[PDB]
Amino acid sequence: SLANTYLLQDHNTLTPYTPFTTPLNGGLDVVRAAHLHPSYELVDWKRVGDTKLVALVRSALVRVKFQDTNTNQNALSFDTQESQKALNGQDFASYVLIFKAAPRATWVFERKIKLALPYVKQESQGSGKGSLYKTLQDLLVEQPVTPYTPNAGLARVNGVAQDTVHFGSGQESSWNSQRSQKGLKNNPGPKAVTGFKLDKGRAYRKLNESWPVYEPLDSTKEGKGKDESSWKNSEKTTAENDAPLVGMVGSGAADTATFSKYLNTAQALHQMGVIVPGLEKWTDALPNVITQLYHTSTAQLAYLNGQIVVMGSDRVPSLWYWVVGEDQESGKATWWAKTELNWGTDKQKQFVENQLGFKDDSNSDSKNSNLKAQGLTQPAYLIAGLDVVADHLVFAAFKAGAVGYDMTTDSSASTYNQALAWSTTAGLDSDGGYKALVENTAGLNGPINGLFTLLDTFAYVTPVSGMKGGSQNNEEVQTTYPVKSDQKATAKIASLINASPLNSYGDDGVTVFDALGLNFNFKLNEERLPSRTDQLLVYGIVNESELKSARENAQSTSDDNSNTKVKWTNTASHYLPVPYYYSANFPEARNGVKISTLESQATDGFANSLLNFGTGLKAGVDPAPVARGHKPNYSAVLLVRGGVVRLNFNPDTDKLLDSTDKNSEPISFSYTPFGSAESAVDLTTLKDVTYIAESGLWFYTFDNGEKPTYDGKQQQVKNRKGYAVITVSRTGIEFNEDANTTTLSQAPAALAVQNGIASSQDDLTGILPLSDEFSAVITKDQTWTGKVDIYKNTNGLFEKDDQLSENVKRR
Ligand SMILES: CC(=O)N[C@H]1[C@H]([C@H](O)[C@H](O)CO)O[C@@](OC[C@H]2O[C@@H](O[C@H]3[C@H](O)[C@@H](O)[C@H](O)O[C@@H]3CO)[C@H](O)[C@@H](O)[C@H]2O)(C(=O)O)C[C@@H]1O
């Protein structure tokens, strides 16, 4: 219509635009309308129906604190003292703002909702069963992955082999003769890696420790890992001297600088939503991990009939999400370590949980604080998005790597100073079909994969798995957690989390093969063998009752219900590796390849070709003709590294669209690799996602300005000016297209294309989809803001309309 207005953001302002391409007023400054502090930033907003507008705001002054040596007191709190200290040179919590429509365009503020810290029960032998508190006390979170992190930066030294673990050094000879009784019966991999060393490399910090701005170029050579003591005492200076910020003897405004040991990524971190004091627009250390965790956690929202869901960023792992009511004043976050998801099958759930840490009935140690031991599920996610459709919430995220680590004081120990993680790729001998493949026992309870020299060829997966061991081939192929039998009651395994969807950073081929999807069986109609811990995509459909249950849980003050979990049944997991061709080694349009030797040819806005990232989840109802009295079809689409994924749902059941067949690949998931041109689009710069109800199309708008100011080698970023638009469109046979279209053999897919709306010249304001044929690109750069350029769609391909753009341009 003409009456319809398109809203567009610019920092904290939301300006209404008409189809004449002109704005109705100077917009709504969400912060100043809410009577909020000037250090506030608007992070997400949604125009609920015709008269409501919900928004999300956060502050870089927020300061969080965790206590580790009274009654119903929470161990997690806001530190208003530090929040005040930052101001020079209340709690500044995040808020959900509700607005009501008024005369002309304009909005009127209606209320504010505080997103309070999640609850955790504090213990004290000087004041007054699974403990999330113990976990947190020894929880080591990785320093965030930047777009400037090279492949060798991820490359951590491999851990010890499992034959050394169970037999000791010098007694490995007796593997085959004693595997049967040591719980490794028919296990063919004695040389299987237990994990990776935490002695050096990229930073791993405790909940009250801080991540540094500097990062290793190669974690086999430099970095200090979890060793905060050594960094602070000697390596801090080395790092500072190697990678100082722009202005060496000229920073004061409030063997010298080689960049061969570290990369200074202060600029990249800032944009990721990480608080970097000094780089504030609205040397000194960064705020503690728990603070950045709260700040980066309040990034995305949705609205479902008086209920606001708030999830975290797609760039930093999130441990908690809010389910606040429109009526409430505040509201605590719900722990992900307490939100149990259906991973498709019990075995798929097991794979993940089993790697969370060490649990045995002989062990009752407090120092053994890992999530598995505290009976807690998967803690962290890299949330791609959430969207509301047909009175249901849909979401997608990449499961972040959450492993166990050895806390032992004993420096002569096998698993001393290392993280415990192993490959979970299905055996070469796996039975055929999807169900058969995901439920394969290879690496379920412990390591099994490594280099196997099958004839005149190599294989990084086990050639014997499941119920195929022994001479007769009917025996069990066994697997066990890397902790020696006699060392079980004494074991001190804490919990560790990576800022990526991988479990092991072990500098080997097996990891590279798991992350790139290169493990395949030797069948005629060759099937790819999947991982059940590395590069996993979690997605699903939740209802109001599941969300209420997630809210009630968060408001609980631990008590007797302290070990009660949230069960989201209509979710699923899917192995989503990065394209192998993104690396220069294996493009398909020496002594083996390890993480550190893996050269990248990725153009998608990352210095690596090892880690997967997911962004812009958007639902959308198919405008196609409806079947014989059936509900209209709807799907969700998202952009991952290398292609578009489409999540399909049964409208009738309001559940994930299933086929009732175990062998066939799931019809609720589809992945289509996109072309060379769309692989050239920087995915970290996604400004907006938009679905056109009438054309059944998704429009992903990317803005170059969202790129950092300087790279790791402290040089100004190129192509900062410009924008690019991608169109996603439905493809294939649709659920109930005709009468006999009962159950579909294939899954309905999507197609990502750079439709032609692109520039590398001006600063984008936004794109107003005028009609199915014409769209205007509104650009600033010039004095006043508003250049306007009309683009016409020709068979799905945009071309600038010289005539029309020249027309609208005269004031
Ligand atoms: C993950 C893993 O452990 N992979 C190893 C692999 C497998 O153990 C088997 O293929 C299946 O069980 O074997 C690899 O090497 C095969 C050769 O092993 C040689 O034995 C060595 C070896 O170091 C030890 O097994 C032994 O204690 O000492 C021997 C040297 O003195 C054999 O002599 C040879 O015939 C092969 O069988 C493989 O790459 O396939 C090694 C993997 O680490």
Contact 339, 377 (CB under 8 A): yes
Element holding 566 (H helix, E strand)? strand 566-568
Whether residue 469 has its Cβ less than 6 Å from ligand 1: no
CA–centroid distance, 191 to ligand 1, in Å, is 8
Cα–Cα distance list, 321 to 182, 199, 288, 336, 550 (Å): 42, 32, 20, 7, 9
Specify the residue with its C-alpha closest to ligand 1, atom 27: 173
State the Cα–Cα distance between residues 461 and 451, nearest whole angstrom: 7
Cα–Cα distance list, 572 to 35, 341, 345, 497, 542 (Å): 42, 8, 9, 21, 12
State the Cα–Cα distance between residues 5 and 23, nearest whole angstrom: 9
Whether residue 450 has its Cβ less than 6 Å from ligand 1: yes
Resolution (A): 2.8
Q: What is the DSSP letter of 29?
A: E
Q: Specify the ligand 1 atom closest to the Cα of 190.
A: 3
State the Cα–Cα distance between residues 386 and 571, nearest whole angstrom: 13
Neighbours of 621 (CB within 10 A): 16
Contact 263, 215 (CB under 8 A): yes
State the Cα–Cα distance between residues 476 and 312, nearest whole angstrom: 42
- Residue whose C-alpha is closest to residue 723's, from 700, 702, 754: 702
CA–centroid distance, 460 to ligand 1, in Å, is 13
Half-sphere exposure of 241 (CA within 13 A, CB side): 7
**Structure-determination approach:** X-ray
Residue owning tokens 């990480």: 274
Cα–Cα distance list, 363 to 57, 338, 368, 562, 592 (Å): 45, 22, 8, 21, 40
Cα–Cα distance list, 462 to 194, 341, 477 (Å): 15, 28, 10
Listed in sequence order, the residues at least 6 apart from 458 whose beta carbon sits closer than 8 Å to its beta carbon are: 451, 452, 592
CA–centroid distance, 354 to ligand 1, in Å, is 27
Query: In whole angstroms, what separates CA 469 from the centre of its chain?
Result: 37
State the Cα–Cα distance between residues 597 and 618, nearest whole angstrom: 37
Handedness of CA 616, 619, 621, 624 (dihedral sign): positive
Backbone angle region of 556, left / alpha / beta, with phi > 0 → left and psi within -120 to 50 → alpha:
beta
Bridge-based pairing of strands 566-568 and 339-341 is parallel
The DSSP-derived string for 262-273 is: EEE-HHHHHHTT
Contact 22, 44 (CB under 8 A): no
CA–centroid distance, 449 to ligand 1, in Å, is 13
The DSSP-derived string for 422-467 is: ---PPPTTPPSSHHHHHT--TTSSS---S-B--TTS-BSS-SS-SS
Contact 190, 161 (CB under 8 A): yes
Separate counts of helices (H) and strands (E) for the chain:
15, 40
Cα–Cα distance list, 63 to 90, 245, 581, 805 (Å): 11, 24, 43, 48
| Angle (nearest 5°) at CA 388 between 325 and 655 | 110
Q: Specify the ligand 1 atom closest to the Cα of 192.
A: 1
Whether residue 463 has its Cβ less than 6 Å from ligand 1: no
Whether residue 190 has its Cβ less than 6 Å from ligand 1: yes
Contact 653, 541 (CB under 8 A): no
Element holding 136 (H helix, E strand)? helix 132-137
Show the tokens assigned to 705.
């300005």
Show the tokens assigned to 784.
């006043």
Q: What is the DSSP letter of 578?
A: P
State the Cα–Cα distance between residues 567 and 547, nearest whole angstrom: 10
Q: Specify the ligand 1 atom closest to the Cα of 163.
A: 3
State the Cα–Cα distance between residues 375 and 131, nearest whole angstrom: 8
Listed in sequence order, the residues at least 6 apart from 768 whose beta carbon sits closer than 8 Å to its beta carbon are: 6, 8, 17, 19, 21, 775, 776, 778
